[PDB]
Amino acid sequence: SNKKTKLIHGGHTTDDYTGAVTTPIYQTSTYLQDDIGDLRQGYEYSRTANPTRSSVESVIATLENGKHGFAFSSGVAAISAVVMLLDKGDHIILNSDVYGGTYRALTKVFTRFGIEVDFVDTTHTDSIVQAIRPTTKMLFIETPSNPLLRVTDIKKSAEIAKEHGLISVVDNTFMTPYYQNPLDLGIDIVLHSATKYLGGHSDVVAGLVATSDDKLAERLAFISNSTGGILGPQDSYLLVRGIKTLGLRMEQINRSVIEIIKMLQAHPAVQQVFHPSIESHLNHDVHMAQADGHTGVIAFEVKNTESAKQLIKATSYYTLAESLGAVESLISVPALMTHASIPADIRAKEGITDGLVRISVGIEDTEDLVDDLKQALDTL
Amino acid sequence: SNKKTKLIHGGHTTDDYTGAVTTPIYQTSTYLQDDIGDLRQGYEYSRTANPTRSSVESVIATLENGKHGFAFSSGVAAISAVVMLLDKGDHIILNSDVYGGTYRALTKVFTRFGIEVDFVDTTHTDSIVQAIRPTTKMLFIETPSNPLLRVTDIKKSAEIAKEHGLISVVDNTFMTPYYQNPLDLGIDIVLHSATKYLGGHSDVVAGLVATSDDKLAERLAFISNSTGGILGPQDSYLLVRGIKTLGLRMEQINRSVIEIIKMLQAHPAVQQVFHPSIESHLNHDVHMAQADGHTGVIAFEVKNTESAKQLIKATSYYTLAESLGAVESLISVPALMTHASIPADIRAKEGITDGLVRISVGIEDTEDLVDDLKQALDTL
Amino acid sequence: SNKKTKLIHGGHTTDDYTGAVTTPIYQTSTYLQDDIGDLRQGYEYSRTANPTRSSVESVIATLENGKHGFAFSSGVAAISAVVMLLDKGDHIILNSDVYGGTYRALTKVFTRFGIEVDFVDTTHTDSIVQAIRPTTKMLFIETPSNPLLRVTDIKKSAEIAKEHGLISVVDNTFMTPYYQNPLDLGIDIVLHSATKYLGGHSDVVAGLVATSDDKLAERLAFISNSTGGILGPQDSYLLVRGIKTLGLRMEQINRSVIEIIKMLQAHPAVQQVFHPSIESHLNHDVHMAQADGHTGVIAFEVKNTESAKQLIKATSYYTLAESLGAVESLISVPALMTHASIPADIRAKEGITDGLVRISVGIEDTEDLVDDLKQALDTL
Amino acid sequence: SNKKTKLIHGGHTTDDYTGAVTTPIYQTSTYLQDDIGDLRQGYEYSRTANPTRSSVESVIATLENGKHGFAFSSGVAAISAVVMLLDKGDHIILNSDVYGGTYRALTKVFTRFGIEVDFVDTTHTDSIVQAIRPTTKMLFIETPSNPLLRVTDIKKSAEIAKEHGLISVVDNTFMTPYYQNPLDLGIDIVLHSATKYLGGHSDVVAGLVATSDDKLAERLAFISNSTGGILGPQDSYLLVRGIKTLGLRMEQINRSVIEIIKMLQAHPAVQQVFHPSIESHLNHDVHMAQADGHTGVIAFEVKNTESAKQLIKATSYYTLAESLGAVESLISVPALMTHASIPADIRAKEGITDGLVRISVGIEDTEDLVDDLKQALDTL
Numbered sequence A, B, C, D: 001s002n003k004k005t006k007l008i009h010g011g012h013t014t015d016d017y018t019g020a021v022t023t024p025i026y027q028t029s030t031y032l033q034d035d036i037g038d039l040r041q042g043y044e045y046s047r048t049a050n051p052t053r054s055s056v057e058s059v060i061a062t063l064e065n066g067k068h069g070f071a072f073s074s075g076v077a078a079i080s081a082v083v084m085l086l087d088k089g090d091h092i093i094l095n096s097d098v099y100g101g102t103y104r105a106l107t108k109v110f111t112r113f114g115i116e117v118d119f120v121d122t123t124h125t126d127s128i129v130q131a132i133r134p135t136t137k138m139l140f141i142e143t144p145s146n147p148l149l150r151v152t153d154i155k156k157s158a159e160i161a162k163e164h165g166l167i168s169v170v171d172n173t174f175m176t177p178y179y180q181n182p183l184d185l186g187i188d189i190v191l192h193s194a195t196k197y198l199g200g201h202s203d204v205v206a207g208l209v210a211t212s213d214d215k216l217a218e219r220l221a222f223i224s225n226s227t228g229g230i231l232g233p234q235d236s237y238l239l240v241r242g243i244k245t246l247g248l249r250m251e252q253i254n255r256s257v258i259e260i261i262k263m264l265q266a267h268p269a270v271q272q273v274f275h276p277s278i279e280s281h282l283n284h285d286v287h288m289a290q291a292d293g294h295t296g297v298i299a300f301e302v303k304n305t306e307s308a309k310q311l312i313k314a315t316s317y318y319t320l321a322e323s324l325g326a327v328e329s330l331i332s333v334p335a336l337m338t339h340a341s342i343p344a345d346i347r348a349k350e351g352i353t354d355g356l357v358r359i360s361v362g363i364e365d366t367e368d369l370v371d372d373l374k375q376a377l378d379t380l
């Protein structure tokens, strides 16, 4: 019925054989056959299928209201498998500010294989329509994006893709299946870096993909079996375990996000704040129409580099590290950490200022996170 | 000094911090930074590098006398990363009977990206010279091959690749680093399905790659970080653990291989036997010059399908399952299991007869394995 | 500062060496020494100490405001280590309705070693005073107890123990450190079955012990090292991971407990309800004075055995299984499952009626759990 | 049939459900019941039984030719469970030089519970007969012992125990089930620190117990369930995995032991050598009659403390660390590490001289281990 119940009882995460209430960890590569070709339970070689991996795949398919799930060794392995649905000469449209790893994979790996890409401003969906070429085969969007949290209309993107015969893909990492379900809005394929919120404990690198399309699922299964970027069984188990608390974790994160944004907007040492919950944020209405909650990633401007570094050093409960979706609140400076190779003037033009700080809100007490960030900002 | 000592003390497989005599399992995705950009020990995000994975990479680099190691989520993920060194329009030469997964990846995935491939009989190395095109960039060989154990001259292949400016790659799965070291013979890149002998216990799916070439290593590291087919930390740990006994396991397997082949050659229900240790085997001399032991994979002909099935049912110590390199002796029928989609007449032309049986010799007692297979053959 | 923050940042659960934001899993038995007797980081043999186990021990010591933590292979191993503080001829007072495993250990194992025990009604603390013998050395209490949730005054029990020179022990499993902190109320030793709420995911069997007493800690460390009921490193890691969400899980459980109790009290198919939150419950005031929340275990009477079985079969979201503290809501019938060997008339005298049902509330949606249990009760 | 085959195919170490060729890791605490009291496969709570633990228990029962196996959290937890078969007032006879942890457990823990113990020289079995008291209930022997490798006659000890109504127990750690099978010689209970040779990779702390006696098995199962020193599932899995190579590892170790002893006997810097393979060793004939191989533990005298330390520093392939049964060769000095709290004059009287060195031979190349130790001794 309701989402918190579905997180516990959705998917197949018990052992039919013993009744174990958690998925057994099948640390195994191969399986006995009683007769040549007769598989006891459908398993024959762990690259092709492994029962613990099948469990986490059933979970992500259930949570995204899809039919087929796929677990990969990383988020970018999931993205690469999806891109491999295309051939040399095919074209992809993506949002302009896609994740740096996605940008790198597309422009430094897959363009060498003849895949063509264009990065356009999808916050106006007619930009997608203009960018469609006779060779376009795929539309790939993140919403909200990193680190400025730009929002793209999922339902309209799906309609455009359907009209023009494109495979539509949404990277749903930042919102999770708890708040945003792209397959329900007509999208062909949804994917996640499960490294972030889904695992939730900063202890698994993994990607997850879900679809309702039987033919796309067959193609993805073939790509996974042939290029072999599969998630192992221990990591699959830890993902299943982490997903159990996704609802509680996201709800705590959201309570803190709301109070933190209030504080940041009031604080004189903070300038622009970037988050889709802010009513003046571009496509705020679109976000609220396609999601019933918020990501825990917030970006905001302080004055300069020295102020950003001082902010990081003055906090007690914000941890300097890469990644997001931890139980810990994480803090970073995109201009120094993720966008550092981009020329400074171009960073500034794109809004990635020296003083732009990104936080990924964790599950600490809300009052503590607000007070800690506020007292640290008071030292500026 | 000697190989069995190198297996124990080669590579870095202890904890410098606590002194733990085994590699800690870093079930983690990200790492604290004390200052922005300052990494305590060089780690920042587990997709890019993870200390347990670094341990297994150091092991495979040491055992193959290379400088750089890479651990992937599967053997075919290692192969795919190596193929991704090339661009659309580049050409690869491979041996004619390459592993089915390699054949599938190349002809159903990478040809869609404009990679061109030719499968030629590399048992005569002048066949390679004839097949070189102006666009050829890579030579990829297995030796010995599956399931007929064809042998290719590694040193001559390396010389040809060097003269013609090709990247040379050897899939060294069947021989392992214990018996055959392609990098020592001039090969650029060596790779393994660690799923087989290296892990050794049928409980990890994994690939390993080693090279001495700094530039190829940089390119492989970029591909691994960008497409993300990385091995997780638990599987990395189990690989390090399994490799400790590689020498003892391979030596037991070899003692059994020799006695089993004697039995098969004497038995009236067995026709042709395929293994590089047989003195009339093509390129037997080449194999003995480039390896100081043998693979545990043997193929041999019985009369027909019914005889093969009866053989499988009559054995007590041979287990019907996919894969090789277990501690258990495994048995299979290629025409029914791995080559089944190929037309029967073409199978026969290629020597994959209905009665061709493949065994992967395990570490059971030699007398038991000989006697068991012999008594089972006596029922034919 | 606040409890939810302490759950994330309390204890030492990162790697000082690499900066890994999770505790490495030291799957190791022994440690290099650079010189005889010189330990790099204090580790020499994993039975004596293991760094992953040290992490979970630091967590439980922090959460209970103690100084020393100890991790055992099970809750009853923790209890047995604590009982082994005593000698033949020493006497223990315990509450009358102590956990069945504790009762069994004391009356079938430790009485064979000359430990004397008396089980008295500790809901009136003067019962403890009367039961003190010249040989009494320990007072061991659970609060609230199972399955009728009897409450014992912790502060008064600690005062009695101090005045009479007894070691005071509280089994704090049902309340967890999130709601009840016996060491703060003067108790010498607090212990948990971490199998229940602390691990929280039904996937670790483990016990945890904490104390502020240096001498008791030294004695417990000696007992643990000598009898060896230690928690392994993988289970220690999973405990550390599970504890991160303890606050969120307990708070969800408590919201559901309150609404479920309202429903049960209103329902005509339910008679007596047992839970310390009910204002007419014995020692309700005492509980509220020593805890700031509630356990998720509730017991309630339906008519008979057939009604209890029908209730179990009619629910969709209550799972029939042993144990408590899962993410799933669990349901059981003590008279058939835990108290079955006790004569029926004695069960009835003790209030363990044929129709007594115990539920352990999980983290499913509150409305779903209420509605599901209510519709199932409507079928009676 | 033969031992190396039994190590692979003995016990139940596959999954009947999926056919997985390795034992699944049941990281779980509890199990679904379809009806109250109906267990799908006999599992209800992991402390009582866990399927991965059941696998390793089946292995040790098979390898020792027993009927029942038990897996504990450590060797000393197995020993403690066995001692708990007795009551206050019962007496145990043990060999004089029993393992220090066993000595400590008995004399500092179990004597506080009224168990009486005597440590006698069991190398003459009539010493046992003299030591029998009217209250003696158990005879507990190690053979060979540590660190001087004293040998006790197992068959005669079993006969004495049977005649006098004693439970007979052999700690078979040093020999392993590969070479010595006490249950076959009439002993009631055999136990191991699986931390040593059985796990074999210095990465599990664990104990194992086997018996053929149904009544002793019932009592041990009750003790394990009640005091809870159980082995967890990950450690159980790693034990099953390590045992696969026990035969190969022990045989390599034995080849090295023989050559190393030859070297030590010839070397002028070495005085007495202690190992049961030496023909002048006390009870050499007894050992050869009850075992068909040797332990890898050897002790030998060099001149003094400084010589022992120099030996340790001069070796390349001998590692200073506690424990034995690693894949690495380990070296230690009992007088400084295990026997240090004993007065120096008493150490000398017992033969634990300042220059007594203990090595635990690993699986490195035999020539390397011989040459390394010899060149290190040459520096003295």
Ligand SMILES: O=C(O)CNC(=O)Cn1ccc2ccc(Br)cc21
Residues within 6 Å of the ligand: A001, A002, A003, A005, A006, A007, A009, A010, A011, A062, A065
């Ligand atoms: O949760 C929501 O609000 C909407 N989700 C649904 O469509 C309900 N739903 C679909 C599959 C499924 C499995 C278990 C449970 Br419990 C609920 C389930």
Ligand SMILES: O=C(O)CNC(=O)Cn1ccc2ccc(Br)cc21
Residues within 6 Å of the ligand: A097, A098, A099, A100, A101, A103, A338, A339, A342, A346, A347, A350, A352
């Ligand atoms: O690593 C990350 O997450 C940052 N991602 C990128 O580098 C994306 N990207 C690619 C070209 C480019 C130019 C300006 C800006 Br602003 C961003 C750009």
Ligand SMILES: O=C(O)CNC(=O)Cn1ccc2ccc(Br)cc21
Residues within 6 Å of the ligand: B001, B002, B003, B005, B006, B007, B009, B010, B011, B062, B065
């Ligand atoms: O082993 C052989 O026969 C040949 N191999 C070698 O080149 C020796 N060798 C190279 C690196 C290295 C590390 C540890 C040990 Br121990 C030996 C090592």
Ligand SMILES: O=C(O)CNC(=O)Cn1ccc2ccc(Br)cc21
Residues within 6 Å of the ligand: B097, B098, B099, B100, B101, B103, B338, B339, B342, B346, B347, B350, B352
């Ligand atoms: O799956 C496996 O291991 C078998 N590998 C293959 O299918 C390789 N392969 C590809 C075309 C082809 C034609 C005849 C024969 Br014979 C083999 C062929």
Ligand SMILES: O=C(O)CNC(=O)Cn1ccc2ccc(Br)cc21
Residues within 6 Å of the ligand: C001, C002, C003, C005, C006, C007, C009, C010, C011, C062, C065
């Ligand atoms: O949490 C409460 O209400 C009371 N607890 C405390 O006494 C606060 N406290 C004690 C140790 C400690 C470590 C980290 C953090 Br964050 C808070 C800590």
Ligand SMILES: O=C(O)CNC(=O)Cn1ccc2ccc(Br)cc21
Residues within 6 Å of the ligand: C097, C098, C099, C100, C101, C103, C338, C339, C342, C346, C347, C350, C352
């Ligand atoms: O297993 C469990 O949890 C139940 N625990 C017990 O059996 C405790 N216990 C011991 C004697 C006794 C008599 C009546 C009643 Br009511 C309970 C009793």
Ligand SMILES: O=C(O)CNC(=O)Cn1ccc2ccc(Br)cc21
Residues within 6 Å of the ligand: D001, D002, D003, D005, D006, D007, D009, D010, D011, D062, D065
């Ligand atoms: O191995 C020896 O020399 C003696 N051992 C035996 O008594 C043979 N034996 C007993 C049980 C059993 C299970 C599998 C295999 Br294979 C062999 C087995």
Ligand SMILES: O=C(O)CNC(=O)Cn1ccc2ccc(Br)cc21
Residues within 6 Å of the ligand: D097, D098, D099, D100, D101, D103, D338, D339, D342, D346, D347, D350, D352
């Ligand atoms: O720790 C270890 O392994 C060493 N074991 C012991 O301490 C055993 N032990 C107990 C009293 C005693 C007196 C002399 C000698 Br010699 C040994 C003695």
Ligand code: NA
Residues within 6 Å of the ligand: A008, A009, A010, A011, A012, A013, A014
């Ligand atoms: Na489910």
Ligand code: NA
Residues within 6 Å of the ligand: A183, A186, A187, A188, A212
């Ligand atoms: Na659709």
Ligand code: NA
Residues within 6 Å of the ligand: B008, B009, B010, B011, B012, B013, B014
């Ligand atoms: Na090393």
Ligand code: NA
Residues within 6 Å of the ligand: B183, B186, B187, B188, B212
């Ligand atoms: Na080279």
Ligand code: NA
Residues within 6 Å of the ligand: C008, C009, C010, C011, C012, C013, C014
């Ligand atoms: Na902390």
Ligand code: NA
Residues within 6 Å of the ligand: C183, C186, C187, C188, C212
């Ligand atoms: Na106190």
Ligand code: NA
Residues within 6 Å of the ligand: D008, D009, D010, D011, D012, D013, D014
């Ligand atoms: Na078996």
Ligand code: NA
Residues within 6 Å of the ligand: D183, D186, D187, D188, D212
């Ligand atoms: Na017997």
